Swiss-Prot record:
Name of the protein: Small ribosomal subunit protein uS11
Family: Belongs to the universal ribosomal protein uS11 family.
Residues of the full protein shown: 12 to 81 of 151
Modified residues (Phosphoserine): 5
Function: Component of the small ribosomal subunit. The ribosome is a large ribonucleoprotein complex responsible for the synthesis of proteins in the cell. Part of the small subunit (SSU) processome, first precursor of the small eukaryotic ribosomal subunit. During the assembly of the SSU processome in the nucleolus, many ribosome biogenesis factors, an RNA chaperone and ribosomal proteins associate with the nascent pre-rRNA and work in concert to generate RNA folding, modifications, rearrangements and cleavage as well as targeted degradation of pre-ribosomal RNA by the RNA exosome.
Gene designation: RPS14
Species assigned in the record: Homo sapiens (Human)
Transmembrane residue ranges: none
Taxonomic superkingdom: Eukaryota
Quaternary assembly: Component of the small ribosomal subunit. Part of the small subunit (SSU) processome, composed of more than 70 proteins and the RNA chaperone small nucleolar RNA (snoRNA) U3.
Subcellular compartments: Cytoplasm; Nucleus, Nucleolus
Length: 70
RNA sequence: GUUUUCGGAACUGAGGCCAUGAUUAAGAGGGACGGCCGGGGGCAUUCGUAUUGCGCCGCUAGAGGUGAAAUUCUUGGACCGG
């Protein structure tokens, strides 16, 4: 703060809410995050976009690295 | 001449009497009816998410699959979310 124009006009006490569609199946992990509606997504990261081993895509190691980028 | 009811055999109508004549109701069966009961059967009827595909929309570089990988789908926006 300021950003500036990105993000809505907010106060100190209150906060803006989003939704994280965490599709953590086997063989991969998705930490998709969107607006409160669900359709205007903000940041989409998956486990495979970080690990290059093609087998750890659902491993816990890939899982939190993707989430922190979100 | 025979009369032969005569001997017996023939059919038919009105009677009495017979305690007048039907064992039982199977921890057999069949039925009947009463209140139910049951993912029993058939015909229609309605609902549910899911899957697949589609049309938009935002979004981005991988997605899928495997013990690992690959065939495969991917800037024609794949996968994801509405
Ligand atoms: Mg693949």
């Amino acid at each position: 703060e300021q950003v500036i124009s990105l993000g809505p006009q907010v106060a100190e006490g209150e906060n803006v809410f989003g939704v994280c569609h965490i599709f953590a199946s086997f063989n991969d992990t998705f930490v998709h995050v969107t607006d409160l509606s669900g359709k205007e997504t903000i940041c989409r990261v998956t486990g495979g976009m970080k690990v290059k081993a093609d087998r750890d895509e659902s491993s816990p190691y890939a899982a939190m690295l993707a989430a922190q980028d979100v």
